[PDB]
Amino acid sequence: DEFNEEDERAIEMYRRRRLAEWKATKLKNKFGEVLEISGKDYVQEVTKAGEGLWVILHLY
Amino acid sequence: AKNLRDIDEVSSLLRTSIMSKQYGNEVFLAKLIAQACVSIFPDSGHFNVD
Amino acid sequence: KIAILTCPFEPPKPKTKHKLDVTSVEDYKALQKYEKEKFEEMIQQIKETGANLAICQWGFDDEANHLLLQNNLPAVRWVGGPEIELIAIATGGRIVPRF
Amino acid sequence: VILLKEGTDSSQGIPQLVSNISACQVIAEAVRTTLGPRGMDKLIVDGRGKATISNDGATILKLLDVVHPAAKTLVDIAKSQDAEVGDGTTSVTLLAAEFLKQVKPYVEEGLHPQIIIRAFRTATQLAVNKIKEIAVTVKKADKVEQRKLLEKCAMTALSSKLISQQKAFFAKMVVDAVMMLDDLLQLKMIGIKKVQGGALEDSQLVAGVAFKKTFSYAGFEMQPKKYHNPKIALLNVELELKAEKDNAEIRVHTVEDYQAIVDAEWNILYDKLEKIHHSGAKVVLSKLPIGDVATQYFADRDMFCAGRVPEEDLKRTMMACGGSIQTSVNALSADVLGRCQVFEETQIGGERYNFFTGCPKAKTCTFILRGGAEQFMEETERSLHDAIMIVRRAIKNDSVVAGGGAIEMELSKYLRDYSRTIPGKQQLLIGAYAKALEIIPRQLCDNAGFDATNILNKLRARHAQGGTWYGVDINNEDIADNFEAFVWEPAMVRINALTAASEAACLIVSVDETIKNPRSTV
């Protein structure tokens, strides 16, 4: 229900870009459990938490 | 063209394409190109510009 | 007479992602015993070594606060780093990293 | 229908090249006074307010930007010379500019790029051969004379740069600084610590290696700040409570296992500490942070620890001290360990610099220069870099040429007297080349506000048939054999100068027309 002709040049190229996108996005799925670190280390994650990664710093 | 293998023949031939550039020096580039191409050509059955 | 600590008064957690599997009410009582004995052994260690004053860099919990109180051993907590460093310098003692 | 896309244009023929020559002269005059011992300095201001001040012409040309093709050629040639030599960039840019100026009127009458290009190239070739043939050298191979002439060439470099009261002082300083280096002549093993306060004369040379003490947590100031023969271990390992490989997971079932695991982590830490301590080293350095527990342990064990050290610092540490970088401690032995006779955390102008000297091996140095301005210290450091470059090039080929404009007049005279046998328009154009070859001493004289015409006349008369090596002094304002004044600079600078000059001349004279896109890509 999507195929009329396949030029195999830009469309295989589309598979290539799509698979690169998929590997890039699924290589980052490492989280999913909110964690309880201690205040002793606190300086080490307020600053040494990775650049380019958002940190939702919840306090309660 | 006889062989496409000897160095002096390469100089004499390709210099003709070379006059379109660098009117003030010819033989130097001829030496460079002839040495490089004679080194690189397998001389048997095939070639790629790459 | 003072001892200088850089650690809180609480069952520490390791730096690695740790998962303690609990499947029995016996493990529940084991956890309860573990926390209570940890607090009491911390108190025994500190009060036993022969000091009167305690100082905590990163604070600690009110349970250990009352344990220090009714043990009649004065203590302080939540002090800046170089402040503690100069305190140890002046008193001539040593900052013990852990119990 | 328009043949080409709307918005474009093009200038052609004589008008185009005339505009290009004009641009060349406009950009050239912007540095008309920089070179020379009496040089007069310029400033630039950027939109960030980071005003920059320099008198070295190439850097100046980078500080400025154009959109003209010829001026872009000039600035890129300045880049090339600076990366090649690093001195006289003013001289090369200027000289090409007046060649183009001197040839400007020749386009209005019958003359073609062919003859002028051939004349330029052949004259450049002959003059480069002259450079090679009459370049002066020690030809002595003894280290005393070698060192002496290195310092003389250094002060020659300073004979057009900013400072003039510390010429021999800094020349000997840098010559020794490089003589405590290997034959690799690596450009990463030269530490530079700009120090606030302190006189310009107070700039010094650390025989060992010093650097800045990075931030440390509590528990410091109990460590012994002095040792009479410490041993150094060069690490790249972390001494902080960390998970194993950031992906390890722990699955236990009772509190006893939990306690065992945490105490086991502590045991890993303390076992690394035991390995370090029992290894015998007295100091540890690394890129990696040192946990407060390790610092408290080493203070309790009277040992110095420091982490988060930049790589180049550690590289200098290995290259001078004689140790070896470690990523592991399990195989720590004597051969890995470094060794020095002096460690101290000294105070140099309100700062905390860690000093490690007493190392019998020394293949890197860390300059400690003193001053009161970030910009003036930066300019002095830039001149130091220039001196480093000049000596590093010259240290290979110990053949030089006298500065002070003597050699330029020598070559101008050679071209002139030889340009009487060559025929026709080639002869006339080569004579124009030679006449353009007569400005740099004139520009030096007019930089100091001197009657350059008279000075050039007298020096030409003296050069003709009364001896060579006659330069212009500025404190004496006269002409004499100033080669024996020892203002001597390398000759590969001259050869590269001629190469770039011929390149530029033949390039811009080859210009005929340019089409300009509507540049919608903005």
Side-chain angles (χ1 to χ4, degrees):
Chain A
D1 54 354
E2 289 290 85
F3 292 165
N4 57 351
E5 66 181 1
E6 283 280 306
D7 316 322
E8 91 173 339
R9 181 52 34 65
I11 318 296
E12 293 273 18
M13 191 279 258
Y14 184 110
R15 271 84 66 188
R16 285 180 171 88
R17 312 300 309 110
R18 169 205 75 197
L19 71 83
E21 293 179 353
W22 270 127
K23 64 93 175 179
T25 184
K26 68 193 155 57
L27 198 43
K28 200 47 61 180
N29 298 115
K30 294 189 288 282
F31 292 163
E33 164 206 13
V34 59
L35 57 84
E36 313 178 34
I37 61 171
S38 299
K40 188 201 190 70
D41 183 297
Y42 202 70
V43 56
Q44 195 268 331
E45 72 276 15
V46 184
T47 60
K48 302 101 197 172
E51 198 165 344
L53 177 63
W54 292 74
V55 176
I56 185 66
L57 189 64
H58 174 70
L59 275 300
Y60 81 97
Chain B
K2 296 185 313 162
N3 303 97
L4 280 299
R5 307 303 154 75
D6 175 30
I7 189 167
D8 285 328
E9 64 184 1
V10 178
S11 71
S12 46
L13 306 180
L14 307 190
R15 192 186 76 261
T16 311
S17 170
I18 306 312
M19 283 75 74
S20 294
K21 269 78 60 182
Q22 282 76 247
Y23 184 84
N25 53 2
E26 275 81 357
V27 191
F28 182 76
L29 323 178
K31 316 149 187 199
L32 188 153
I33 295 309
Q35 295 159 242
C37 73
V38 174
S39 86
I40 198 62
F41 195 48
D43 314 319
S44 299
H46 197 76
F47 178 74
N48 189 0
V49 185
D50 296 330
Chain C
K1 310 182 177 188
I2 187 177
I4 298 89
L5 275 162
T6 49
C7 68
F9 293 165
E10 208 60 35
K13 270 72 174 178
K15 198 53 63 73
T16 304
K17 294 165 281 187
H18 56 300
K19 275 72 57 183
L20 198 147
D21 291 331
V22 301
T23 57
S24 81
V25 291
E26 280 61 41
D27 288 331
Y28 208 79
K29 306 315 146 187
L31 276 176
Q32 192 162 7
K33 176 186 285 291
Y34 183 60
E35 50 91 17
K36 278 169 67 49
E37 64 87 11
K38 281 303 298 162
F39 277 92
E40 264 311 316
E41 69 90 19
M42 301 265 277
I43 294 299
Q44 172 277 335
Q45 267 176 118
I46 301 299
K47 191 179 207 55
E48 192 67 28
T49 193
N52 320 126
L53 183 62
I55 171 167
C56 303
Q57 177 164 338
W58 320 75
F60 60 104
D61 184 56
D62 50 359
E63 166 184 0
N65 281 108
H66 183 229
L67 264 63
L68 302 163
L69 187 153
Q70 81 177 293
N71 278 299
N72 296 115
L73 189 152
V76 68
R77 62 186 213 166
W78 278 125
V79 178
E83 190 164 26
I84 291 177
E85 162 163 322
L86 276 186
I87 285 180
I89 285 157
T91 197
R94 296 289 220 161
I95 315 176
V96 55
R98 65 160 175 160
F99 290 74
Chain D
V1 170
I2 52 173
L3 178 76
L4 318 178
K5 185 200 41 163
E6 161 64 57
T8 185
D9 61 349
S10 182
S11 184
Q12 66 280 359
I14 321 169
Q16 168 50 44
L17 59 86
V18 167
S19 295
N20 278 34
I21 302 152
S22 81
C24 181
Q25 323 315 302
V26 175
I27 193 66
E29 59 79 35
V31 290
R32 189 45 45 73
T33 45
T34 43
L35 202 70
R38 322 303 204 100
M40 188 66 203
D41 189 358
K42 277 78 172 177
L43 175 140
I44 185 61
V45 170
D46 200 301
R48 311 145 60 258
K50 180 67 173 66
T52 304
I53 298 89
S54 179
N55 58 1
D56 202 19
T59 309
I60 297 169
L61 270 55
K62 276 74 70 177
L63 301 189
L64 188 153
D65 180 75
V66 298
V67 290
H68 198 278
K72 268 172 147 292
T73 316
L74 279 154
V75 65
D76 288 354
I77 292 165
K79 293 163 57 187
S80 64
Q81 168 81 10
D82 186 74
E84 190 36 79
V85 163
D87 195 310
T89 79
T90 51
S91 71
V92 298
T93 313
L94 193 149
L95 57 85
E98 70 274 15
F99 294 111
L100 183 62
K101 172 186 169 195
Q102 281 287 349
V103 176
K104 180 182 286 292
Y106 281 164
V107 65
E108 307 307 320
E109 88 294 336
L111 210 49
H112 212 260
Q114 296 286 331
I115 283 297
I116 191 65
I117 294 169
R118 184 192 281 106
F120 277 136
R121 299 267 202 241
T122 191
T124 301
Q125 182 266 334
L126 299 168
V128 163
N129 295 119
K130 201 85 163 67
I131 299 168
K132 282 168 143 296
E133 73 201 55
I134 64 188
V136 71
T137 184
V138 288
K139 202 55 186 174
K140 287 307 294 176
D142 45 355
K143 182 64 178 175
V144 165
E145 292 209 18
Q146 210 157 3
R147 179 179 309 279
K148 187 267 294 178
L149 187 138
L150 267 69
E151 317 195 352
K152 292 306 187 54
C153 287
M155 61 79 71
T156 301
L158 317 180
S159 77
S160 79
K161 289 171 187 171
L162 192 151
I163 67 160
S164 307
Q165 318 80 22
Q166 315 76 6
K167 322 202 55 178
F169 167 75
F170 271 114
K172 179 194 159 311
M173 211 285 278
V174 71
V175 164
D176 308 338
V178 291
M179 295 299 102
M180 283 74 74
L181 312 180
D182 58 355
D183 292 332
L184 177 52
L185 299 174
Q186 183 64 221
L187 278 188
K188 308 296 291 305
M189 295 299 102
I190 310 163
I192 296 298
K193 300 295 187 291
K194 312 178 180 183
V195 188
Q196 198 47 255
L200 160 61
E201 202 53 42
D202 296 330
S203 182
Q204 79 168 56
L205 169 58
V206 162
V209 161
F211 60 95
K212 194 261 183 184
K213 181 267 290 180
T214 73
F215 154 74
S216 73
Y217 320 122
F220 182 75
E221 292 166 351
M222 291 66 78
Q223 293 183 163
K225 321 298 187 201
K226 186 54 161 312
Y227 313 93
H228 290 319
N229 188 259
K231 284 179 283 188
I232 309 96
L234 271 300
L235 284 173
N236 218 338
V237 73
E238 175 173 357
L239 313 187
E240 190 186 4
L241 290 175
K242 190 187 74 65
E244 200 65 18
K245 300 245 202 169
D246 203 80
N247 46 359
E249 284 179 44
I250 309 303
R251 201 174 290 181
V252 301
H253 308 264
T254 180
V255 304
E256 188 275 332
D257 303 342
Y258 196 41
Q259 177 73 20
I261 301 299
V262 292
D263 301 333
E265 174 175 343
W266 292 97
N267 280 315
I268 295 170
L269 155 68
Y270 278 107
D271 285 326
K272 266 177 291 193
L273 311 188
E274 281 157 276
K275 163 70 79 161
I276 297 169
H277 177 76
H278 186 262
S279 302
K282 187 35 72 153
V283 293
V284 294
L285 280 299
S286 160
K287 290 175 71 175
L288 301 200
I290 316 303
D292 61 356
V293 186
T295 67
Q296 296 144 37
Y297 203 84
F298 276 1
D300 182 30
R301 271 71 182 179
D302 309 336
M303 184 177 176
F304 190 103
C305 51
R308 282 204 175 93
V309 181
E311 262 297 332
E312 294 166 353
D313 293 330
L314 305 168
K315 299 297 293 296
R316 293 190 179 83
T317 313
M318 283 74 75
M319 187 66 204
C321 178
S324 312
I325 175 61
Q326 271 310 113
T327 68
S328 56
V329 298
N330 297 115
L332 275 176
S333 67
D335 57 350
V336 191
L337 297 178
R339 48 202 75 188
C340 68
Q341 315 149 331
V342 161
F343 160 76
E344 187 165 288
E345 203 155 273
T346 75
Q347 158 60 262
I348 309 286
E351 315 314 312
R352 303 301 316 169
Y353 286 167
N354 314 332
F355 276 67
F356 297 74
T357 59
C359 48
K361 302 287 100 175
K363 285 317 173 182
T364 179
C365 314
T366 292
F367 277 173
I368 310 296
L369 53 85
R370 316 295 316 275
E374 66 181 2
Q375 294 282 305
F376 169 71
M377 280 315 78
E378 267 166 300
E379 152 67 31
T380 52
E381 176 268 330
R382 168 187 296 103
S383 47
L384 294 174
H385 193 317
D386 306 327
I388 294 160
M389 295 299 102
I390 303 307
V391 65
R392 203 158 94 88
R393 309 169 310 111
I395 197 53
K396 283 78 174 177
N397 50 2
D398 54 346
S399 173
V400 287
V401 298
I407 62 170
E408 177 152 347
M409 295 298 102
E410 306 279 327
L411 57 92
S412 302
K413 192 190 59 185
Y414 151 72
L415 186 50
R416 175 149 326 283
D417 74 358
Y418 182 68
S419 180
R420 320 280 188 150
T421 66
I422 55 176
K425 328 173 198 178
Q426 301 269 43
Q427 181 183 2
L428 282 72
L429 274 50
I430 284 302
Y433 197 51
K435 186 64 180 176
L437 293 174
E438 320 168 2
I439 179 164
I440 290 298
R442 181 177 181 87
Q443 183 52 38
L444 294 174
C445 295
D446 297 305
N447 279 7
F450 299 162
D451 179 11
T453 80
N454 203 331
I455 305 188
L456 272 70
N457 285 284
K458 309 165 312 174
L459 59 82
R460 276 169 291 187
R462 294 302 307 152
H463 284 127
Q465 278 83 34
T468 70
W469 297 115
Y470 299 153
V472 65
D473 188 357
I474 321 302
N475 297 324
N476 199 2
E477 309 88 33
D478 207 298
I479 68 168
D481 198 311
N482 301 0
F483 169 85
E484 293 181 354
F486 311 132
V487 61
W488 305 345
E489 61 188 1
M492 51 205 167
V493 192
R494 280 281 300 97
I495 290 158
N496 175 38
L498 295 199
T499 307
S502 65
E503 276 173 305
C506 297
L507 203 163
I508 316 295
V509 74
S510 306
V511 182
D512 54 350
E513 184 269 2
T514 310
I515 310 96
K516 277 72 69 178
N517 280 30
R519 65 175 315 201
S520 177
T521 58
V522 60

